[PDB]
Design a protein around this motif. Structure first.
Motif, PDB file in Angstrom:
ATOM      1  N   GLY C   1      -6.063  44.922 -27.811  1.00  0.00           N
ATOM      2  CA  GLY C   1      -7.197  44.027 -27.664  1.00  0.00           C
ATOM      3  C   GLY C   1      -6.982  42.922 -26.650  1.00  0.00           C
ATOM      4  N   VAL C   2      -8.038  42.604 -25.895  1.00  0.00           N
ATOM      5  CA  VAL C   2      -7.952  41.546 -24.890  1.00  0.00           C
ATOM      6  C   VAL C   2      -7.674  40.205 -25.556  1.00  0.00           C
ATOM      7  CG1 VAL C   2      -9.238  40.292 -23.128  1.00  0.00           C
ATOM      8  CG2 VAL C   2      -9.394  42.789 -23.245  1.00  0.00           C
ATOM      9  N   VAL C   3      -8.403  39.904 -26.635  1.00  0.00           N
ATOM     10  CA  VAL C   3      -8.216  38.638 -27.337  1.00  0.00           C
ATOM     11  C   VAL C   3      -6.879  38.610 -28.070  1.00  0.00           C
ATOM     12  CG1 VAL C   3      -9.209  37.129 -29.112  1.00  0.00           C
ATOM     13  CG2 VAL C   3     -10.697  38.296 -27.469  1.00  0.00           C
ATOM     14  N   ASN C   4      -6.354  39.779 -28.458  1.00  0.00           N
ATOM     15  CA  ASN C   4      -5.044  39.827 -29.106  1.00  0.00           C
ATOM     16  C   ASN C   4      -3.958  39.259 -28.201  1.00  0.00           C
ATOM     17  OD1 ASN C   4      -6.079  40.943 -31.442  1.00  0.00           O
ATOM     18  ND2 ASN C   4      -5.643  43.060 -30.833  1.00  0.00           N
ATOM     19  N   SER C   5      -4.052  39.511 -26.899  1.00  0.00           N
ATOM     20  CA  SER C   5      -3.180  38.852 -25.943  1.00  0.00           C
ATOM     21  C   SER C   5      -3.631  37.409 -25.727  1.00  0.00           C
ATOM     22  CB  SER C   5      -3.169  39.606 -24.615  1.00  0.00           C
ATOM     23  OG  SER C   5      -4.401  39.464 -23.933  1.00  0.00           O
ATOM     24  N   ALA C   6      -2.704  36.588 -25.218  1.00  0.00           N
ATOM     25  CA  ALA C   6      -2.923  35.169 -24.949  1.00  0.00           C
ATOM     26  C   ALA C   6      -3.016  34.424 -26.274  1.00  0.00           C
ATOM     27  CB  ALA C   6      -4.161  34.931 -24.077  1.00  0.00           C
ATOM     28  N   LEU C   7      -4.167  34.516 -26.937  1.00  0.00           N
ATOM     29  CA  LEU C   7      -4.302  33.999 -28.294  1.00  0.00           C
ATOM     30  C   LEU C   7      -3.473  34.853 -29.243  1.00  0.00           C
ATOM     31  CD1 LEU C   7      -8.122  33.212 -28.582  1.00  0.00           C
ATOM     32  CD2 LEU C   7      -6.261  31.546 -28.554  1.00  0.00           C
ATOM     33  N   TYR C   8      -2.523  34.223 -29.933  1.00  0.00           N
ATOM     34  CA  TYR C   8      -1.524  34.933 -30.732  1.00  0.00           C
ATOM     35  C   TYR C   8      -2.113  35.378 -32.069  1.00  0.00           C
ATOM     36  CZ  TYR C   8       2.803  36.061 -33.118  1.00  0.00           C
ATOM     37  OH  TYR C   8       3.793  36.717 -33.811  1.00  0.00           O
ATOM     38  N   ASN C   9      -2.883  36.463 -32.021  1.00  0.00           N
ATOM     39  CA  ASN C   9      -3.379  37.081 -33.243  1.00  0.00           C
ATOM     40  C   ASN C   9      -2.210  37.692 -34.006  1.00  0.00           C
ATOM     41  OD1 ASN C   9      -6.058  36.379 -32.821  1.00  0.00           O
ATOM     42  ND2 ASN C   9      -6.573  38.290 -31.768  1.00  0.00           N
ATOM     43  N   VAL C  10      -2.061  37.302 -35.270  1.00  0.00           N
ATOM     44  CA  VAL C  10      -0.828  37.592 -35.989  1.00  0.00           C
ATOM     45  C   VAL C  10      -1.055  37.445 -37.490  1.00  0.00           C
ATOM     46  CG1 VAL C  10      -0.014  35.224 -35.743  1.00  0.00           C
ATOM     47  CG2 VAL C  10       1.617  37.087 -36.102  1.00  0.00           C
ATOM     48  N   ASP C  11      -0.427  38.339 -38.250  1.00  0.00           N
ATOM     49  CA  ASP C  11      -0.438  38.355 -39.704  1.00  0.00           C
ATOM     50  C   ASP C  11       0.970  38.093 -40.241  1.00  0.00           C
ATOM     51  OD1 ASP C  11       0.770  40.766 -39.031  1.00  0.00           O
ATOM     52  OD2 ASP C  11      -0.070  41.815 -40.766  1.00  0.00           O
ATOM     53  N   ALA C  12       1.123  38.303 -41.550  1.00  0.00           N
ATOM     54  CA  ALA C  12       2.275  37.861 -42.331  1.00  0.00           C
ATOM     55  C   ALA C  12       3.630  38.120 -41.683  1.00  0.00           C
ATOM     56  CB  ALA C  12       2.230  38.510 -43.714  1.00  0.00           C
ATOM     57  N   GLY C  13       4.392  37.042 -41.464  1.00  0.00           N
ATOM     58  CA  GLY C  13       5.805  37.117 -41.176  1.00  0.00           C
ATOM     59  C   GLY C  13       6.195  37.161 -39.713  1.00  0.00           C
ATOM     60  N   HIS C  14       5.282  37.510 -38.805  1.00  0.00           N
ATOM     61  CA  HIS C  14       5.661  37.733 -37.407  1.00  0.00           C
ATOM     62  C   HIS C  14       5.817  36.393 -36.697  1.00  0.00           C
ATOM     63  CE1 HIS C  14       4.963  42.159 -37.406  1.00  0.00           C
ATOM     64  NE2 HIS C  14       4.174  41.838 -38.413  1.00  0.00           N
ATOM     65  N   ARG C  15       6.925  35.729 -37.005  1.00  0.00           N
ATOM     66  CA  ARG C  15       7.201  34.369 -36.555  1.00  0.00           C
ATOM     67  C   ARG C  15       7.561  34.381 -35.080  1.00  0.00           C
ATOM     68  NH1 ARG C  15       4.999  33.860 -40.492  1.00  0.00           N
ATOM     69  NH2 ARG C  15       5.412  32.455 -42.245  1.00  0.00           N
ATOM     70  N   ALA C  16       6.562  34.155 -34.235  1.00  0.00           N
ATOM     71  CA  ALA C  16       6.858  33.935 -32.830  1.00  0.00           C
ATOM     72  C   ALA C  16       7.456  32.547 -32.677  1.00  0.00           C
ATOM     73  CB  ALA C  16       5.606  34.078 -31.974  1.00  0.00           C
ATOM     74  N   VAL C  17       8.785  32.461 -32.728  1.00  0.00           N
ATOM     75  CA  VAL C  17       9.454  31.205 -32.437  1.00  0.00           C
ATOM     76  C   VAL C  17       9.068  30.799 -31.029  1.00  0.00           C
ATOM     77  CG1 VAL C  17      11.642  29.994 -32.417  1.00  0.00           C
ATOM     78  CG2 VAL C  17      11.279  31.910 -33.938  1.00  0.00           C
ATOM     79  N   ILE C  18       8.555  29.590 -30.897  1.00  0.00           N
ATOM     80  CA  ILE C  18       7.961  29.123 -29.658  1.00  0.00           C
ATOM     81  C   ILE C  18       9.026  28.370 -28.869  1.00  0.00           C
ATOM     82  CG2 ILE C  18       6.142  27.666 -28.706  1.00  0.00           C
ATOM     83  CD1 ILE C  18       4.506  28.307 -31.249  1.00  0.00           C
ATOM     84  N   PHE C  19       9.371  28.882 -27.689  1.00  0.00           N
ATOM     85  CA  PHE C  19      10.362  28.231 -26.835  1.00  0.00           C
ATOM     86  C   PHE C  19       9.717  27.743 -25.540  1.00  0.00           C
ATOM     87  CE2 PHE C  19      14.405  29.196 -28.942  1.00  0.00           C
ATOM     88  CZ  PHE C  19      14.083  30.273 -29.739  1.00  0.00           C
TER      89      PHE C  19
END
Lengths: 178, 117, 128, 117
Positions: C1-19
């Motif tokens: 999905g286009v919106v899935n990229s950029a905007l971090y669409n995400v469900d349980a546990g997928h911790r994108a540690v932000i650096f």
């Protein structure tokens, strides 16, 4: 050469040793400063040396003439400036076909000090002994001896027979009991 | 390109001895995790993957008996980042695998010969 | 999905540690939400904290056992606040390197503590 | 994507949330089939009404030295009207092979350890 004609650019940590083919080999300790590189193959060759392992055992009899084989994990780091000073023999990566002689001499004198079993029950003792013998001879090679391991002990099928039979004796004590 | 010619970025778990091979010595310039200066034309990164790296090593070992038995250790390890140049001058960028069989084969064998393992 | 990229669409546990890219870690760890992650101030180092049931078997002995076969199911997540540290000290893995370190060592010592019949007797107290 | 993700009428009466994780309040509620509509991207589909699936979990086990016997315990796994708000975050994926095996098996071990049957 071309890109390093009047220049060399000392590869400290990789120790490119210059072999002055123009005069045979270098009599200058490389790389103690930028060296002039003559087009007639007066050129550096990387001899980093660097972890140089050689895990070699030696077949030898023991105090009771047992077939003991210990893979000495030989590890050399040739002395930084001394290997360049060894230009009368081997300025290159010190020939690892010559070095195993350190074990064929030392390990043969080391085995039969302990007969196998004494080493099995007392490692550190003989390990320090062999490391000291190896260190002295490493100095004779002009090399820094790194941690050499006294390991992978093959010692005698008569001893493995004896220990399995020792357990058989205990098994028979209990088996006959019951 | 030019960015890589002047600097280098590590997201994490990697060091690099930015060692000047050409015109000088810069080995003290250890890559701090992240962005750090280096010029590849003269200054060559010796990259060390310092993350918790496992390695299961298995070997028959001794005991307070004549019996030897196979004992194994899953060596988790990290190269000592702040001393990379030192080891680099001694053993170089492969010691993390070459020194361990000289280490564990006596860690185990010493300890197990002292016990009845 | 286009919106899935950029905007971090995400469900349980997928911790994108932000650096950031790169001086260190951003103040936050996000894995349940939807917001932009620009990999210069927001690098999405995803550790899937979704629980991990690992049934690790161990063949061992005890105070008197020679052959006992003990399987241990460990359900676990990683600590979100420590994921930055994990990333720089372990990488993107939060397991598999250290999974044996939380199974094998413990079980070998625990089974050595117990014996023939007490593994059976204690059960949940062995697990304790 | 968007259109179908927003559709929430759907013939039926099933309990499922389209959870707005960006502000985590909704979590304890559901969308009932027969509604319409919710945000396709910020809200996420979680199945609360899970049918009564007959999961058989079996395990041998003993007591002291009492022979190991295999308990056959089948679980109907009733719908989770208000249990998924925590289950999905914890497990997410089907618990039937993630935590339910322990929920049954560990108990089975306690059972025969007591000596029954």
């Amino acid at each position: 050469g071309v890109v390093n004609s009047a220049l060399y650019n000392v590869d400290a940590g990789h120790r490119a040793v210059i072999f002055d083919r123009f005069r045979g080999v270098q009599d200058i300790v490389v790389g103690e400063g930028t060296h002039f590189l003559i087009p007639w193959v007066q050129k550096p060759i990387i001899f980093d040396c660097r972890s140089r392992p050689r895990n070699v055992p030696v077949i030898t009899g023991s105090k009771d003439l047992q077939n003991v084989n210990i893979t000495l994990r030989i590890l050399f780091r040739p002395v930084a400036s001394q290997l360049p000073r060894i230009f009368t023999s081997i300025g290159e990566d010190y020939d690892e076909r010559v070095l195993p002689s350190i074990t064929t001499e030392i390990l043969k004198s080391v085995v039969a000090r302990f007969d196998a079993g004494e080493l099995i029950t007392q490692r550190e003792l003989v390990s320090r002994q062999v490391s000291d013998d190896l260190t002295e001879r490493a100095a004779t090679f002009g090399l820094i001896l790194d941690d050499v391991s006294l390991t992978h002990l093959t010692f005698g099928k008569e001893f493995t027979e004896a220990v399995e039979a020792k357990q058989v004796a205990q098994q028979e004590a209990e088996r006959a009991r019951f | 390109y030019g960015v890589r010619e002047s600097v280098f970025t590590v997201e994490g778990g990697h060091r690099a001895i930015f060692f000047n091979r050409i015109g000088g010595v810069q080995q003290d310039t250890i890559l701090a995790e992240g962005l750090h200066f280096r010029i590849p034309w003269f200054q060559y990164p010796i990259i060390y993957d310092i993350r918790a790296r496992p390695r299961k090593i298995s070997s028959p070992t001794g005991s307070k008996d004549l019996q030897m038995v196979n004992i194994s250790l899953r060596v988790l390890s990290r190269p000592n980042a702040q001393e990379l140049p030192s080891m680099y001058q001694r053993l170089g960028l492969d010691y993390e695998e070459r020194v361990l069989p000289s280490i564990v084969n006596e860690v185990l064998k010493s300890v197990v010969a002292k016990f009845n393992a």
